Assembly symmetry: D2
Homo-oligomer: 335 residues x 4
């Protein structure tokens, strides 16, 4: 034994998409807002991330958070998302996990009906509710950033074989790129992964050329890191089924929070029975996220809605990672 | 299984007298100063202390702490000390403890010659210097709050046995009654411990709520709470031994950093010790702290001295405490 | 960090009197019978016991065990009990402990009404029946080794105080001196504990190496080692209280299953108790075992009775003990 | 918190290829030989495996062992390999890990020079040596089963584009299938994974048709589950570099023990400077295994050698997996 470093994480799976919630092993991180500490992390500790998110600890499609000091009064605690490619500003399937764990472990004093909790992200402070059955969490609704559509139609170019064919782009907290099942020839199922993943990243990269758009408000993030594919379900109590590509080439095991929070737009201004209507969006693996909306905030330059998404996270063990200082791969290695 | 609350501690021992350093299972406490953090703990989440310090988890003696976010400028993380009986404003084995582990587990980036780490009691911030021999920590050298003689001798009381007479009172993080082993007829040895305990608290009671206890600054304290007895040593190296009684009726196995730092800060104001002059305080259990007297500096009332005490802590396992909600002792029990 | 040895235990408490159940950090001991396994432990890897039972890790009292591979036919896993002073051939709170956890953590496939688990002391195999209320364990009901009156009263000795006279001796997993609280002038209360301890061991010494200690079968034992004192209860429910002294000078906080199982196995051979007849033994700490007297069966010398004692254990956290090789107390210390 | 199950694992990475060494959470497994317990595991517990080896805990290319009771005298302990597709009979990169951990953690009492250790696999008992530098493991040589070649030339069929082209087949403890870099057009590097993996499994499956051979001795295992591709290094202190496909479609991050133990055959009967000659075989990721041989056992029907392979394993944290009984994915899910 040597190790030199020792980080305590808690694993969750949020409808299939894993989350490593680091709890103990780094007590304070300087910055004022989560962005300030984020910058500090990305600049000073940075690639603790690599170690936990890459092999031989994690894998390509691994994802996780860091619980921290609030700094902002209000109450609760601070979170910082992360993945094989760096850090997410929001992850939704992270906000659920993080919340579900916190309460289940303690950290947040739990109620009998439903325990509200506000967590500090680098992006906006996030409102998770978590309904509990006397003792334990049943599922979390996380209220999402106002989401909208950037353009109607799209089409550009696809390497093989059709060449052309219409698509669609929107927001969701981060932008997105959505298409249909009928053009390439895919049936979103576990078996065919490679064509989707391999078609996904080239579509991501080649719409970073000049179509690339910045939304009104917040000028820093630009163009696409999230490619999306609908089809509609193979499971009865559902209505759509969809996969999402991102993160140095990784994929989401859940229907995609930020993704779904964006999709359930469109059908607000496209005539599909509007507010407080039931919608259950399911993943490629085949697991459910409930979506529904409330406020519908137009405001000039766009038309937008403030979407409420729900899901379930479960605890899949407790970790105490350590870093043999001779281990030459002690940090990450990418593949 | 079912638990509801699950807290991640790190067992250390510091010349005996172990410390359970809490690391994980609570992420936040807005506080401001580490006393306004301590206050919050005692008036809210005290039910932790009862759990870990008392049986079945802890025992009569048994000491620990909590790592925090600092708020305080620079301050590398900030700490709170706790025992079966309540919370110590400061603790020299508790500090020495926290320091070692923090560096050992990589919570602190470890410097190669000596690692300077600042922690927040908030009995001032404290500057621990952690010596590391290429690979490993050699020893800690914690520089403490200014220490002084408070009132001088005063008169003793009876219940048992005989009204008796002389002793002394002095501060060094908390307030101490420093009396000779002869003055009441004790020999610092395991055979008598029971007596020293039963004696100390009965004293610690009846020299409170009869007298004037106060600190030139920080207000609040107005409580000794710490009874220190002293005789010569059965070790050539050591200069003096001592036991310390506090918290419900619990004893230190280390010479008591705060206790020693207070004693030698009565000397010099006596002339038996001058600046540096190697000092080595011993406990009951053949375990020693290598004191010295660096710099004077009065305290806005009467003259004083900042002392640096030195010692060694060792990591004695990693704990994930959990509390079965049916378990009636869930929050420990007294005896 | 650097440790070299890292052992994985599971803290439980069984009506107080905690048990550290070792689970992980050693995988094998060829032994044959669980005594030939115990032998090996004590003549080799005893340095574990000193570590976990003594300070800094454990304390004066503090009890634990080890889960093993059985070898023995059927036997679901097999156990070894241990304390600060050495190893108990059998223990009713140590058994009740092991049972609960084993089922609780899923080591045993948990049956819904009642879960029958066989463990190997090897003070015989023992049949614990673990009641589970749909989700959770309600209580354990361990059926023990045949118990009996051994020699009857005999005469007491002095050192302190007064030579005195009557008492009794009886077996129930180990050998007990069962004497009244009146017989030496004690009241079973925390205030006196110190006396009961100091008394018990001085007795436990001087009623050994002066007398005839022996078991009709299994040979070897030829040692009491367990002093049991008894008075009436300050509880309506409870029928009798008791304390038990053993191992270097340590006390039980449970009524002492093995201790109680031995006491009521002197009654009936007396006529104050017959088959079933609800019995409830209490400790010093307001904690009770619900005894009964099921079936006779002599012991190849003199008549005897197999008693079933019942109680409750709770999981009080999970430990990964580690031993810094520089740490001079690495293997604990005495006081 | 609920979980119902709680398995303690220790993670390693053996030159990139991960290993989850389960230690605590299942104390005894019935069977006599490791095959008997294996059969028992595969039949009764089975898909604890799925949970730990599949997502959301593990991933497709995850691999691990189970430490157990020896049963066989000799000494030490029992191991059982496992992966997403079931169980391996040998894994070499498992035998190293397992050994490296055991000693590093304790479990096996360690020496000053080199600590021999014999572990019970379902296949033959395995001899790992582990050289240690006063305190810590430097690297393990594991002595491998007698390995040989089944046929010289091969060629069969490849879907695109050449159609034909020569290859080669051998043993290694398990069979294998080896080819060159020059025929399809691949440069074994992280970037191009998919073509190799996708070309690998179809080559695996379509040489399970009737070419399928059983080696002399042990009639149970048949044909191929291991496809292999040499090229030779991009790293100076090496001589070959090679990737290996298997396990429901997974891949090896290390040069492949059983694989390499087979390859370093051929060059014993093909004139390449024979016994006790240095050979370092490196992986697709680019990390070294040392191979060299000793005995060369011809025996009629084949010509064979008993190969000695070396490597390094490092500890990448300690796990305490748990299985929320409501979590619908609580066990595995494949992709
Ligand atoms: O669900 C989300 O919010 C998300 C972010 C990145 C991938 N999914
Ligand atoms: O080491 C000390 O200073 C201390 C505080 C309480 C007991 N010992
Ligand atoms: O509960 C018991 O039987 C026991 C054994 C040792 C102390 N208590
Ligand atoms: O290295 C080995 O022995 C092995 C077995 C399966 C894959 N690699």
């Amino acid at each position: 034994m040597k190790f030199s470093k020792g980080i305590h994480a808690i694993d969750s799976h949020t409808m299939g998409e894993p989350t490593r919630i680091v709890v103990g092993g780094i007590p304070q991180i300087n910055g004022e807002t989560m962005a300030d500490k984020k910058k500090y992390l990305e600049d000073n500790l940075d690639y603790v991330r690599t170690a936990l998110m890459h092999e031989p600890r994690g894998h390509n499609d691994m994802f996780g958070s860091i619980i921290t000091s609030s700094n902002n009064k209000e109450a609760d605690f601070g979170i910082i998302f992360m993945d094989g490619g760096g850090y997410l500003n929001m992850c939704g399937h992270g906000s659920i996990g993080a919340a579900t764990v916190a309460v289940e472990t303690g950290m947040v004093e739990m109620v009998e009906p439903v325990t509200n909790i506000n967590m500090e992200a680098p992006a906006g402070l996030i409102k998770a509710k978590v309904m509990v059955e006397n003792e334990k969490v049943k599922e979390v609704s996380i209220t999402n950033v106002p989401s909208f559509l950037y353009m109607e139609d799209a089409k550009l170019e696809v390497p093989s074989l059709n060449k052309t064919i219409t698509f669609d782009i929107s927001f969701g907290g981060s932008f997105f790129a959505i298409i249909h099942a009928k053009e390439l020839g895919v049936k979103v199922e576990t078996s065919q992964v490679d064509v989707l993943k391999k078609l996904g990243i080239e579509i991501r990269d080649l719409i970073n050329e000049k179509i690339k758009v910045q939304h009104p408000e917040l000028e820093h993030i630009k163009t696409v890191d999230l490619v999306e594919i609908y089809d509609e379900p193979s499971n009865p109590e559902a209505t759509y089924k969809n996969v999402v590509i991102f993160g140095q080439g990784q994929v989401d095991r859940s229907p995609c929070g930020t993704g779904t929070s964006a999709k359930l737009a469109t059908l607000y201004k496209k005539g599909h029975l509007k507010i407080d209507e039931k919608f259950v969006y399911e993943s490629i693996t085949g697991t459910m996220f409930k979506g529904r909306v409330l406020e519908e905030t137009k405001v000039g330059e766009f038309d937008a809605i403030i979407p409420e998404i729900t899901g379930g996270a479960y605890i899949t063990g407790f970790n105490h990672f350590v870093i043999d200082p001779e281990d030459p791969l002690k940090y990450g290695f990418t593949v």
